[PDB]
Design a protein around this nucleic acid. Structure first.
Ligand SMILES: [K+]
Ligand SMILES: [K+]
Ligand SMILES: [K+]
Ligand SMILES: [K+]
Ligand SMILES: [K+]
Ligand SMILES: [K+]
Ligand SMILES: [K+]
Ligand SMILES: [K+]
Ligand SMILES: [K+]
Ligand SMILES: [K+]
Ligand SMILES: [K+]
Ligand SMILES: [Mg+2]
Ligand SMILES: [Mg+2]
Ligand SMILES: [Mg+2]
Ligand SMILES: [Mg+2]
Ligand SMILES: [Mg+2]
Ligand SMILES: [Mg+2]
Ligand SMILES: [Mg+2]
Ligand SMILES: [Mg+2]
Ligand SMILES: [Mg+2]
Ligand SMILES: [Mg+2]
Ligand SMILES: [Mg+2]
Ligand SMILES: [Mg+2]
Ligand SMILES: [Mg+2]
Ligand SMILES: [Mg+2]
Ligand SMILES: [Mg+2]
Ligand SMILES: [Mg+2]
Ligand SMILES: [Mg+2]
Ligand SMILES: [Mg+2]
Ligand SMILES: [Mg+2]
Ligand SMILES: [Mg+2]
Ligand SMILES: [Mg+2]
Ligand SMILES: [Mg+2]
Ligand SMILES: [Mg+2]
Ligand SMILES: [Mg+2]
Ligand SMILES: [Mg+2]
Ligand SMILES: [Mg+2]
Ligand SMILES: [Mg+2]
Ligand SMILES: [Mg+2]
Ligand SMILES: [Mg+2]
Ligand SMILES: [Mg+2]
Ligand SMILES: [Mg+2]
Ligand SMILES: [Mg+2]
Ligand SMILES: [Mg+2]
Ligand SMILES: [Mg+2]
Ligand SMILES: [Mg+2]
Ligand SMILES: [Mg+2]
Ligand SMILES: [Mg+2]
Lengths: 168, 96
RNA sequence: GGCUGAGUAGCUCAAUGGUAGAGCAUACCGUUCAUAACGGUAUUGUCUGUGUUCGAUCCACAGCUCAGCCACCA
RNA sequence: AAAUUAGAUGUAAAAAAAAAAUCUUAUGAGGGCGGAUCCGCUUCUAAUAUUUUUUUGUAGUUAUUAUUAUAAUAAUAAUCAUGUUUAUUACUUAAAAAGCUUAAUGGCUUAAUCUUGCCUUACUGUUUGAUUAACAACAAAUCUUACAGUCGCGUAAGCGGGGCAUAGGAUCACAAGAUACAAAAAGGAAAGAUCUUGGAUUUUUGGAAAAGCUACGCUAGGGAUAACAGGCUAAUUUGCGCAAGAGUGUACAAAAUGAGUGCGCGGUUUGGCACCUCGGCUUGACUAAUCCUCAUGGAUGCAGAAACUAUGUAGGGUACGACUGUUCGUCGAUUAAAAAGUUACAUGAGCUGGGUUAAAUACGUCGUGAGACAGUAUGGUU
RNA sequence: AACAAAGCACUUUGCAAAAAGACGAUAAGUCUAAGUAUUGAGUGUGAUUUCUGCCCGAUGCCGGCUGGUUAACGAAUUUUCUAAAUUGAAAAAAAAUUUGGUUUCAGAGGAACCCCCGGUUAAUGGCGGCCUUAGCGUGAGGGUCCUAAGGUAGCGAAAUGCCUUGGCCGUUAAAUGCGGUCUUGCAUGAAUGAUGUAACGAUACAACAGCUGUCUCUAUGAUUGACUCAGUGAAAUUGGAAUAACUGUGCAGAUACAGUUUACCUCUAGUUAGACGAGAAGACCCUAUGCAGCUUUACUGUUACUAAUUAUUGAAUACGAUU
RNA sequence: AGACAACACUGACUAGGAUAGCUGGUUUUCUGCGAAACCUAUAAUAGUAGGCAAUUUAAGUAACAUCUUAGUAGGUACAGAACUUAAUCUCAGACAAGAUGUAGAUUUUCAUACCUAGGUAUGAAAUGCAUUUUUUUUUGUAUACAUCGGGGGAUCGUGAAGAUUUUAUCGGUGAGUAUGUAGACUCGGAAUGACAAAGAUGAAUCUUGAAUAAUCAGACAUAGAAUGAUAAGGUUGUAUGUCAAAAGGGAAACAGCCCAGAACAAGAGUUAAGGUUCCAAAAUUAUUAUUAAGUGAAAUAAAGAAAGUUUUUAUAUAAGUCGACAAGAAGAUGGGCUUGGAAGCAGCCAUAAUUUAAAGAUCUCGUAACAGAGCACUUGUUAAAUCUUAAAAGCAU
């Protein structure tokens, strides 16, 4: 399949579910692993659609067309959103399939890029995509520390210091 | 449904894999790697302080479970005539 | 549980103890100066099984399936 | 591409001996001491386990090599083998899958699977303890024990009251057997009683033999459920704004224009919920997201004029007529312009009743029919 | 526009004791009728002109077999219990047979309805398709499937047309209307009659001329009420009230709560914005193992009516059928 | 015409004889205790029965509740990528030896042709750097023998043959202690809650006997879910509480929120939540900072913009920061191509140089094309002794 069209059956309906809310000190997906730069969702956890991610990719390609680069996608659309008729009355079972989506936690990388482009050009492309994606996004470089919740582990800060009851 | 736990010391398993108690003791959940390395058993011990699985070399711990009562010494007293003066049984024999 | 009818070639229909047929729907040929008509031929074979008789589409039994009314219907 | 067969882990198999310690056990020494086998403390011996532990020993046999005088000693290699090598035996061989009457989950591989032998306990009666007192009651249920009776398999121990587990409804009546209880004067019997057994889309499955219309309708209730309005919400909208800028604009992103989008306001349209059960005329009030009139910025795309866009601003105005029941909408002709919205989609104890609109009637369609229809038509106590 | 109606058509009625039809807890009997097939009754249509086509399969009715089925009746069968007798058994014994009483099983033959055959549309009712064509369209034409038969004549955006304000024409300065016309008529159609005129209509729709205070746009005048004095003297209604405005709140629309604002006390004539104003359980929807009337191939029943037969009630002959 | 048959007619009036699981009503005081709106069944779902269970007061208690200590059952949050699911990324080869050549130095060892045991030559090795190597005409070790076809090229090549080869191409396979994903993934794994034992505490709260009810649309709040649209004062479970049936203080007003459970009085009494300038009981009480917008002050409007302001952390400065002003800003050279024309400045390709105090084969205007005016960059003058620039955060617009 693909990252926008999974190899799943549309007939089997899926519950709404909720994005992952790490409350134990997890840093999964909060670091650039493949490319040199990334696009991080820094405000809140959402459920992005396959149509909103496809538009974000076209925006980056439209801005970086005619140049050498390598775009990695760190999210996959594997959540079937079944929308019942907004004109229908409550009940009578679940709704029909509408589109594919993906749940993303806070401070997680959406895209990554690696190329000989200037830092400014990549920033503009990511900014244009952040305006067309739901939420607020941030430019991230490779090597910066991970993020535990909404707190960056900067200045030698560790995960054990965030768990220590004594902080003052 | 199925043998998640297996019958152990002083326990029996039912047709539907239900584990019962075979004696009057105390329930114990344990694992016996000597008998089977991938099974967990349920047993019943007579002493609350006992610990299973018992060592394979120690003598079996078992209770009598019987009460002593005077034996019946009733000897042959079968009569032949009823209270109505009738024979309690008549014996016939065929001859050829 | 009880009783009765029943189907034959692709399609539609005959044949009752004795050959297993007719018509049609393609095809080939013949006829005609030529065409259309017409004529001839060809296959596609008795619902299935068993039994009775020298001999069975045919009579007897069982079943498939269709149909008649039944039996139960606490 | 898809037929059958053969394969697809590794180790071990002469034999050990001995010292202490860490626990754990013992119906071992009938240990000792407090209260033989009861109990919490207790030494000793023994057993299991654990240390990588302190080690000692690791031969014999066959062969090779070296020294020594065919044997002796040392080192190295091989060594399960008195046995039909197709060896055998023990241990090990992830998970899933296959199999186990049937879906799915769990479980079984040391048997609940497979193969084979003999069998038919897929037995009769009574009965124990449970399902933290089955199903949050009762009942029909589920698992389980014991005793008596007498059968099967097995060397034996022992196992068997159907199936690896979880998916098949009573009474009454009826029918087939048994029991010997009662027998409406008496002797019998009939009809009853007890035990066993069978036939159920009794499927509204704790178990009625059961089709519709009413707009001619009635009563008791409910607003515990609807339509109008109000309320909450805002998917939607024929309501708007901002942000970013692919693109159009001969050139040049932002004069104008603005794909698919993102962040919002607002409560006008069609909707959701269920807290609660029309238009016109007359006469206003209010909002400003502005049709005209006033001031004004930008406008390679502001020469002028006119218009475009935008910023202030709601004082006043926004008319007449034809069609339609119409708000809406179409059109004619004027005008500086003939813009919108809220107020119970303002206003019916102020009017109107054309629309919708009970009884009458016809038409088309649907219905076997009575009748019905978001249908159409004439009429219909405000 | 509905009913009736003259006219039209169909079914029925032979009168010999009752013509049919209607009435009669149910009869005698009455109306029909002191009538007789040109009479009476029932059904539909609705003067007249021009017309009324196709289908008897389904449903209903009518006719018909010495047929099939066939309740009662009934040839042939069969059983429970008990009394007595016989046989058997004669051991602790039933059991079997015949007769009496008692009580069951049982069906060759044997009615109508029904099955089967035929008839009937101004009886209830029904009156389809799919391919191909002289070149694209259009089908005189041809082939094929199905049905009882496939909507004929005529009419046709209709009182019937959802799409729709159908296309065109005329009418208006402007036509969702009206009239004419063409057709593919969602869903026209021939006595549930089709169609075209004369005459008729407080029917419904549209147009023209005239006329007007209907209107642009109202004004004046008259009488009776309204108003004041005198006389007489109601009613609906009313939990109690010292009964303002705004925003908010809240069983979700406040004179009465919160906050702020404003207002001296009390009447009269006007007015109807609110008091979710009053009145009417008026109106809608839902509920009740509540009702009523009506319908039918709902369930369960009763009748008209049809068929057989004991009895009242006795016979003769012929023929046919089972054999 | 369901028309009329004397208020009434889809069947009058009158007398006699009903029911209503429905609505409404049910009358004095004091005192004690005190629910439920859940489960199961029902021709039921507005009803009812049986349970749970409110009450009465007698028997019991090794009762019940709570904590402590020890033990047990079970897999949620979390976390992780093991098994399973979706998608994505990287790798598919490493070493030792051997062999194969090349320029050497002409020293040593070794083998042969010789000469006469030494030299004479001849070669080979030793030696340094290349070089071949996982199925190869290259074996071994260690490893998953660690990869196979299709398609696009370059070679050899035959009477057409496709043997041999290449890919920063496709698919598959193998490997990864690589990245993510979770209602039907859980190897790891809480707290909480549940069961039972002993002990202690406590307000009898518990069980049983006898007697005997009500209730069976619940609402909201908080947390976490399903559903809806990650809307509803929406619908539907779970945990906890309140209201219902609870007054009182606080939240302006307030069924459900924060406190606290009203037998009646007295008190500048002691406190909770909450508050203390005035309405209005109590501070115009102290300390350190921020804001200038009445922002705000008891119901947070968003993204976003910006010489608002403060603070922090870097950084510039008499080697003159910052700003302005004066001049310069070259040359090979109109780079090559393209084009009617392309001269830095339509487009395409290249953009190692050179000489300078510096000067992009050219950043923004301009020309038909040149020219021309600016920029980057460079020197100089003016001039700051806490005074430059940027980023982040706080409060504001
Ligand atoms: K965004
Ligand atoms: K009507
Ligand atoms: K509700
Ligand atoms: K008529
Ligand atoms: K016919
Ligand atoms: K007929
Ligand atoms: K006929
Ligand atoms: K008969
Ligand atoms: K016609
Ligand atoms: K009023
Ligand atoms: K304020
Ligand atoms: Mg129970
Ligand atoms: Mg007697
Ligand atoms: Mg039931
Ligand atoms: Mg049940
Ligand atoms: Mg309600
Ligand atoms: Mg200007
Ligand atoms: Mg003025
Ligand atoms: Mg209104
Ligand atoms: Mg009003
Ligand atoms: Mg009239
Ligand atoms: Mg006529
Ligand atoms: Mg008569
Ligand atoms: Mg007529
Ligand atoms: Mg008889
Ligand atoms: Mg006969
Ligand atoms: Mg006719
Ligand atoms: Mg007719
Ligand atoms: Mg007076
Ligand atoms: Mg209000
Ligand atoms: Mg008051
Ligand atoms: Mg008035
Ligand atoms: Mg009031
Ligand atoms: Mg009527
Ligand atoms: Mg009437
Ligand atoms: Mg109390
Ligand atoms: Mg409760
Ligand atoms: Mg029932
Ligand atoms: Mg009720
Ligand atoms: Mg686990
Ligand atoms: Mg609610
Ligand atoms: Mg209540
Ligand atoms: Mg309170
Ligand atoms: Mg206050
Ligand atoms: Mg005080
Ligand atoms: Mg004070
Ligand atoms: Mg140029
Ligand atoms: Mg150039």
């Amino acid at each position: 399949g693909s990252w926008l069209e999974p190899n799943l059956n549309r007939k089997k309906k899926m519950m709404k579910g909720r994005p992952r809310v790490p409350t134990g000190g997890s840093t999964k997906g909060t670091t650039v692993v493949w490319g040199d730069y990334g696009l991080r969702m820094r405000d809140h956890h959402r459920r992005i659609s396959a149509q909103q991610l496809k538009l974000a990719e076209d925006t980056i390609k439209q801005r970086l067309r005619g140049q050498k680069y390598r775009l990695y996608k760190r999210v996959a659309c594997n959540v079937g959103v079944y929308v019942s008729g907004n004109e229908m009355r409550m009940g009578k079972g679940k709704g029909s399939f509408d589109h594919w989506a993906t749940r993303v936690a806070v401070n997680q990388i959406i895209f990554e890029i690696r190329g000989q482009l200037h830092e400014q050009v990549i920033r503009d492309a990511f900014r244009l995509a952040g305006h067309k994606l739901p939420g607020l996004y941030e430019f991230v470089k490779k090597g910066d520390p991970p993020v535990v919740g909404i707190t960056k582990l900067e200045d030698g800060l560790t995960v054990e210091d965030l768990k220590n009851p004594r902080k003052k | 449904r199925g043998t998640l736990w297996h019958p152990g010391e002083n326990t029996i398993m039912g047709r539907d894999h239900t584990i019962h108690a075979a004696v009057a003791g105390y329930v114990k959940y344990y694992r016996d790697p000597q008998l089977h390395p991938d099974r967990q058993y349920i047993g019943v011990v007579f002493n609350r302080n006992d610990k299973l699985p018992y060592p394979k070399d120690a003598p079996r711990k078992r209770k009598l479970g019987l009460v002593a009562v005077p034996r019946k010494v009733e000897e042959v007293e079968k009569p032949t005539m009823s209270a109505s003066g009738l024979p309690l049984f008549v014996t016939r024999h065929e001859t050829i």
